[PDB]
Amino acid sequence: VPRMPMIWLDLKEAGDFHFQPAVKKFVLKNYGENPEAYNEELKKLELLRQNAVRVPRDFEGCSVLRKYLGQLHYLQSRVPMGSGQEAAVPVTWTEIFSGKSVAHEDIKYEQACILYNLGALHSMLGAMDKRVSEEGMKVSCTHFQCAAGAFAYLREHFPQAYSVDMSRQILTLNVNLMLGQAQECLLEKSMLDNRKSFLVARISAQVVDYYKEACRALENPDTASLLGRIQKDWKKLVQMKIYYFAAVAHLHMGKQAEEQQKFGERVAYFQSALDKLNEAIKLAKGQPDTVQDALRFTMDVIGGKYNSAKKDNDFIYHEAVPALDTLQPVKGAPLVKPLPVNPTDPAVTGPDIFAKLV
Amino acid sequence: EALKQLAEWVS
């Protein structure tokens, strides 16, 4: 089946973070040393920052953002630059939806934006691949789970939002959207393997559940005014995907009834899948050719399998076609997660830049 | 059967 396009998030634009004067001033008082013994280490971290905030849009930009995020934790453990702390300096980033600069004298604000950009870059890497190879499907699934993990970590360990693009209602939308796209990649994988029809139906039902939570978030008035046109572009794709994968789920439920020799049940599920897919086609008006190619392929599957099932039942089996309400819905199978973020993993961080400052 | 294969696949 042709693959649907994916949503990705833009990275935030960074401003100034003059940590050099503050760090040199704190080592002189508190640690009692000459600040100019740390010129080479302050240059290391600034170079690290300029490369983290002007990060290349590939797989290793993630290891650069991770390294800088971990070294920020190292620095804060040795120099107090948090909110209200002795050596805090202004941290400036641009809020994504307004384009306005927001400043906080808190190093945890810098970590929040770096972590936000980690998840956003993962969402770009997940959405860039064509997912034609099983290996491309696996990297997209991991990327979306990593994006969900960064936004989830950001929503828990920074419970007060430094800017509205990182509030908990927006972050929850981001996690639910990234988990739906991760689950969607796994749905592609389970269908390429030719797994059992019931299992595929459970996986596809979970894709619907994630996108329904993202849709409910996008229908909240607070979210729509902040995202602007973005809310209208995302939801048009999400609403259509809700019905598309609802059709995919019932198509595989009808294939299970076929294996169960319930041919009256099989017509009912195929009829439901075709109705939901026709709804997806109607909601997909104006969508790019990637979306339409996927819907045209799926209709060839569902359309022919519905006609053949009704023909077999009307002429061979004569089994009662149940209404859709009388048969139990498909329970989703959540197999994807926000994958955890360890900021201070020494393997991704390398040595502590300021290890000498004791 | 298959879910133990896909659970490792997802990570």
Author numbering:
A (entry chain A): 4 to 361
B (entry chain E): 8 to 18
Paper text:
His domain protein tyrosine phosphatase (HD-PTP/PTPN23) is a tumor suppressor that regulates mitogenic receptor downregulation, endocytic recycling, and cell migration (Chen et al., 2012, Doyotte et al., 2008, Kharitidi et al., 2015, Lee et al., 2007, Ma et al., 2015, Manteghi et al., 2016). A central feature of HD-PTP function is the ability of its Bro1 domain to recruit CHMP4, the major subunit of the ESCRT-III membrane remodeling protein complex (Doyotte et al., 2008, Ichioka et al., 2007, Parkinson et al., 2015). Crystallographic structures of the HD-PTPBro1 domain in complex with the relevant binding regions of SARA, endofin, and all three human CHMP4 isoforms reveal that SARA and endofin binding is similar to that of CHMP4 at the conserved site, but critically extends into a neighboring specific pocket unique to HD-PTP. Altogether, this study identifies the Bro1 domain of HD-PTP as a highly selective interaction hub that coordinates recruitment of endosomal signaling adaptors versus MVB sorting and receptor degradation.
Next, peptides designed from the C-terminal 18–20 residues of CHMP4A, CHMP4B, and CHMP4C were evaluated for binding to HD-PTPBro1. Interestingly, CHMP4 peptides showed much lower affinity to HD-PTPBro1 compared with the SARA/endofin peptides, with KD values of 132 ± 7 μM for CHMP4A, 85 ± 2 μM for CHMP4B, and 89 ± 1 μM for CHMP4C. For the CHMP4 peptides only 11 residues are clearly visible in the electron density maps, whereas 20 residues are visible for the SARA and endofin peptides. All three CHMP4 peptides bind in the same way across helices H5, H6, and H7 of HD-PTPBro1, and form similar van der Waals contacts with a number of conserved residues, including the critical L202/I206 pair. The main CHMP4 anchoring residues are a Leu and a Trp present in all three isoforms (L217 and W220 in CHMP4A and CHMP4B, L228/W231 in CHMP4C), which contact HD-PTPBro1 residues L189, L202, and I206 from two hydrophobic pockets between H5 and H6 and H6 and H7. The mode of binding of CHMP4 peptides to HD-PTPBro1 is similar to that reported for the complexes of CHMP4 peptides with Alix or Brox Bro1 domains (McCullough et al., 2008, Mu et al., 2012). Thus, binding of CHMP4A/B/C to HD-PTPBro1 requires rearrangement of these side chains to accommodate the critical CHMP4 Leu and Trp residues. Overall, the SARA/endofin peptides form an extensive binding interface that encompasses both the CHMP4 site and the S site, resulting in accessible buried surface in HD-PTPBro1 ranging from 762 to 780 Å2, compared with 468 to 473 Å2 for the CHMP4 peptides.
